[PDB]
Design a protein around this nucleic acid. Structure first.
Lengths: 119, 131, 118
DNA sequence: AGAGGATGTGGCTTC
DNA sequence: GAAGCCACATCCTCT
């Protein structure tokens, strides 16, 4: 369903808009997909930050794996990434031990989100 | 594919791991919207449970940590190696590379230093099912 | 115009006046006591004629379609910013919860007297 | 009456 | 001037 590679060889995730409004529901639900086998019920978590914001505030950043798919119901980014800057996503699959997959320049979050020029 | 072939190479070459090897600044990302008091108690108690949330401030890379072999532990969560300080340690598979996180946090400031030192053991043995 | 309310609250002409500063300005004007007034308890006030306040707010902001329904949504946004809170159970009654005494330079008792609020 | 979610709009500042 | 941040203004759903 249009997935993308993460920085880990074992996980892919759905496509995220390049620019979005803080606290606004995403255009397409976020999903983390495991390549290799991962036990149903396994918790998946999402975090975000960068040089301007070490830890962005997030909403509903927790999901559970089911048939290789962790589907986040209404993930939202509340913290902002800064003018021209994107967030680095850290996906964590709590297996034993925990597996982490990052995703650089994942998304830019501002107060307005994308807006047409003004005049 | 839980890991990548160039496991030892990726950790010594790739810039992502490079910057996270030196003792750089780290910090507890939990409940930033709460009074400093409540954050302190939450961070220590959760530390006793063997888990926390730290990020390398400089780079903004966040990590969810679990201090366990692979409640609490011994050399995974140190609360006496220095009064007021807390040494932590937790393994994981970061971007297909077994590594171990080592660092400390000022039980009052809620920040400190940390880094990622390669994990020869887990990496090597991770080739068991990998082959 | 007992005191420069808007000015003492931060308004310096820079951009639009904010809704709470505007209410504060009406509350320090004897003319306006008929549609908005202090209740006599601390910084609590009541919009005895919400439509008129809305109307004036609209006029001041140049939003002819402004009505109480919309002005109050502006007030509800202040609950979390701890600037104004609702007085539960009392129709059209709200209360400044920011530090007006420091901003204005007067206490509630002094301002109620200066405004002759009975 | 009143709470609060969703999202667009104009003033202003910073890059 | 674009692209940030702000404080609403509009519209609504629910109790």
């Amino acid at each position: 369903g249009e997935l993308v590679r993460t920085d880990s060889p074992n996980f892919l995730c759905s496509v995220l808009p390049t620019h979005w409004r803080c606290n606004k529901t995403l255009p397409i639900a976020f999903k983390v997909v495991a390549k290799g086998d991962v036990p149903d019920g396994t918790l998946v978590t999402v975090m975000a930050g960068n040089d301007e914001n070490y830890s962005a505030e997030l909403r509903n950043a927790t999901a559970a794996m089911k048939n290789q798919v962790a589907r986040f119901n209404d993930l939202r980014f509340v913290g902002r990434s800064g003018r021209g800057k994107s967030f680095t996503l850290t996906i964590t699959v709590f297996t034993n031990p925990p597996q982490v997959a990052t995703y650089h320049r994942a998304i830019k979050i501002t107060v307005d989100g994308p807006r047409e020029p003004r005049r | 594919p839980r890991v990548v072939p160039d496991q030892r190479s990726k950790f010594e070459n790739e810039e992502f791991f490079r910057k996270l090897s030196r003792e750089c600044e780290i910090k507890y990302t939990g409940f930033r919207d709460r009074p400093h008091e409540e954050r302190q108690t939450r961070f220590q108690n959760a530390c006793r449970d063997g888990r926390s949330e730290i990020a390398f401030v400089a780079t903004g890379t966040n990590l969810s940590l679990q201090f366990f072999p692979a409640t609490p532990s011994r050399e995974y969560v140190d609360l006496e190696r220095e009064a007021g300080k807390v040494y932590l340690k937790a393994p994981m598979i970061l971007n297909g590379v077994c590594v171990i996180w080592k660092g400390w946090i000022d039980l009052h400031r809620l920040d400190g230093m940390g880094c990622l030192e390669f994990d020869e053991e887990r990496a090597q043995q991770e080739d068991a099912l990998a082959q | 115009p007992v005191i420069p309310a808007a000015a003492l609250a931060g308004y310096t002409g820079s951009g639009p006046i904010q809704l709470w500063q505007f209410l504060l300005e009406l509350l320090t004007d004897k003319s306006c006591q008929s549609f908005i007034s202090w209740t006599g308890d601390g910084w609590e006030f009541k919009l005895s004629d919400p439509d008129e306040v809305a109307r004036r707010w609209g006029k001041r902001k140049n939003k002819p379609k402004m009505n109480y329904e919309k002005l109050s949504r502006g007030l509800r946004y202040y609950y979390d910013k701890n600037i104004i809170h609702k007085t539960a159970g009392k129709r059209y009654v709200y209360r400044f919860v920011c530090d007006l005494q420091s901003l204005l330079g007067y206490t509630p008792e002094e301002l109620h007297a200066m405004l002759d609020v009975k």
